Design a protein around this nucleic acid. Sequence first.
RNA 1: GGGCGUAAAGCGCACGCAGGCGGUUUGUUAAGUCAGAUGUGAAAUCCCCGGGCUCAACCUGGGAACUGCAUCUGAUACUGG
RNA 2: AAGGCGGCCCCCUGGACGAAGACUGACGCUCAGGUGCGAAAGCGUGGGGAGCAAACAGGAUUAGAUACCCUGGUAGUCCACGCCGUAAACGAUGUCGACUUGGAGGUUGUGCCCUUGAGGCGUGGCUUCCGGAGCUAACGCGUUAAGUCGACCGCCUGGGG
RNA 3: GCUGCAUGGCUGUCGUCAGCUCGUGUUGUGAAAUGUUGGGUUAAGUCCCGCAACGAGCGCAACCCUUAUCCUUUGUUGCCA
RNA 4: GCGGCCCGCCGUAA
Lengths: 157, 218, 207
Amino acid sequence: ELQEKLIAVNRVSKTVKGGRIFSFTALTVVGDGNGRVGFGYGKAREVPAAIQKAMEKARRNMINVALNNGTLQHPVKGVHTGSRVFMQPASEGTGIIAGGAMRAVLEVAGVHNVLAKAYGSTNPINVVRATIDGLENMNSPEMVAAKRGKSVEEILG
Amino acid sequence: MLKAGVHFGHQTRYWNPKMKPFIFGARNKVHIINLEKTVPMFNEALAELNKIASRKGKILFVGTKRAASEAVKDAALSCDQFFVNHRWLGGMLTNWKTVRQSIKRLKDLETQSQDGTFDKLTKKEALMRTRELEKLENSLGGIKDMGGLPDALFVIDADHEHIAIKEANNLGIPVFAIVDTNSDPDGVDFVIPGNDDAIRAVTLYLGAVAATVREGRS
Amino acid sequence: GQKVHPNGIRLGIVKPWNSTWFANTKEFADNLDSDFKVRQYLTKELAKASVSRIVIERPAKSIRVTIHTARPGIVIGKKGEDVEKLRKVVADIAGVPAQINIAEVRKPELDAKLVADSITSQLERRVMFRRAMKRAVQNAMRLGAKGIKVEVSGRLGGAEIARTEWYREGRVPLHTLRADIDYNTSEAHTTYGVIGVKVWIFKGEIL
RNA sequence: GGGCGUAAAGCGCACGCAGGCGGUUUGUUAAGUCAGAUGUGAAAUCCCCGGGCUCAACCUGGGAACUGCAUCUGAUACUGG
RNA sequence: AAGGCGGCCCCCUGGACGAAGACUGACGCUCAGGUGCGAAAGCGUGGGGAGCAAACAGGAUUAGAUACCCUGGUAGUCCACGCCGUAAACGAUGUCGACUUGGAGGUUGUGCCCUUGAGGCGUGGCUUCCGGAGCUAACGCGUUAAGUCGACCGCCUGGGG
RNA sequence: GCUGCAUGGCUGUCGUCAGCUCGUGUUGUGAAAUGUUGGGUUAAGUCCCGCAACGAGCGCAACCCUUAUCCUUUGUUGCCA
RNA sequence: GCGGCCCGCCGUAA
């Protein structure tokens, strides 16, 4: 039922007394298409082993977000080590226009219309944090009403 | 309650500033624990432990400190519960899958033990097997007959057993540690202020818990 | 060149010979040559079957041959006509009269010769070597064995230096003489030269 | 809508004119700021609702836009006198 | 203020801090151009000259040794009066103001309590070392911020050339 | 006949030196780390104790041959109290 | 505690 995606694979080395030994890494994202998403990162001597090792690590690590008809009502921005991300809601008919790993994250998450953009550095591992960057720090009107001790209808007005 | 059979903090220079709400005035160079706000928290913790025991939750006891060892081993094995007495192994809970093999080896070794030297008289091998069993039993004696993944943990010293608390938080199991002045409430805890090195104090702590749990089954 | 041959080192401990007969200096070479000729002919003729091991024993004025195989029906045929053709040719090769026997291989996933030449046959049809290796190791572990190691060497498609790979799990102790290790090799001729295959199987330690 | 400990980047350190920026009330002014109204901001071009060339480039009807300027009336929380 | 300042005594002179009380009534902050002060070496005129010592001369070592090592040795280093205006002139961190969990010291004031004693309670200034949240590419910083903010100024825009 | 720099198979060498890795779990954004480090021992990652690690694999050792001491069995072509 | 001892042609595994 869950959707799985593969983002990037690269070869990584290490030096010992006799020479060099190589290894591979994989970055994957998993979502339910409805508001739950997680990611994982695995290493092994062979590509298939790393691929399969990232998946269940992603499965055990999930969070839920609160969208609304395919987005929510926040222009939100998030950061990690050297990456900035900007996402804002789109009206309708539009797609998931977004550059790299943001495309896969927003696709598996369940968003259908968004106007993302990426700044700063763009390596996949840190920009994938776009999950934790802003997706789960998003506020629905009902929880805002609960926090401020009021009712939704006059919070919106 | 009223007997005040529990002493108080270590010293004003070894203290965690997060313990200010529970602290009292300090007079003789050491901090004093306020008992006026410990009874309600203790009663709430006791009620929660009773309702968990009624759910046959397989409570767990820890607290290796060379002073509460026999105390926790006697409080446990009394009603129905298990305990950890020596050398909390890093990853009993997150890596329970591997620890099951050690438990199984202990079970096989003890089954063979009741008729051990009859199988073979090579005294070297018999002696080394006995030594291996003795080494293995203490680290898992209290947990051998457990299904796995208990539903509650009772911890005597908080900062001294931070690895167990981290494992419990990672798995998502409620904790019932006792916090002193030089420790801090970090995990999802039912915080119970009080001294943790006095024999009278620890005995008073464990007696109420044992009575509550042994009542909870019926 | 570092490893002693696993089969040879154990020939007097836990392993038997394949040719068992007595002779003197006059006929030693002739007996060896005859055994070589008959083994070569049998291997050439019975390629399509699954032949594993040929044991040759010389009765006083006679030669006795036993064949181990996993599909005896093909070798023995509808009636005993094909075994009779084989017996005629063998008795032609060696002057003395000959008799033939057939042995039965119960678990073809053991007896490393079968695994090795199965992998070679797969390689001859241009299939990825890694899948073959993993398939064989998984089958052998499923059927029950304390360990197995396979390896392949040669020009695996790339013009670069011929590479080497190997997989292993279980236990394969090679420095203990009590252990019962079965070892055999094979090689496959492709469009880019030959590829070598080696298999170790650890059936079980013997007291 | 970027930076300056080590990647490029804090004057060797002070005093100080012109400039830039001002703690708390009260009272007046309406300069800044805000709201209306009028007069202006050519046509063509862009946009919206339409129309006609077999359709489309093309032509055409009406409306918005021309982020501005000046004048008059009003408001007085904030900045200025 | 920075560059810097160490035997002892006298004369002239600047700043900082504390206690208590009185007084004036926003008189403030920053600062392009401008002005002043800046280690050592160096320059000019006149003195002085013990030790040390660029340049220089011999003796060694070395394949060579215009060097490191040894024996000497001039300018200079010192004083007075004028120039020069640069340093890894570094905490490699501009100046003011406000706010935010803690420990262990050093130095200099002052209030109270038996002031008994090297006692106990406080309350200011200036300084070392750990470390929490937070911040950072990381190292690390961490109430004397590289944390959360405001005012003004100075600089940066690939490496060589 | 050419190409050991297109290869299989088979050898030398570091070196009979004591090392070389993996599964799961934790730490770090990451290359990686931990285990394999520390105290005492051994010919030896050989062993005890400690310790966010808990267990495995190839190595070391043992199982093989010969030599040194006795006991049974057999006694020629071997032996003579 | 201090005696001396310099160099290594051009490109080149995936």
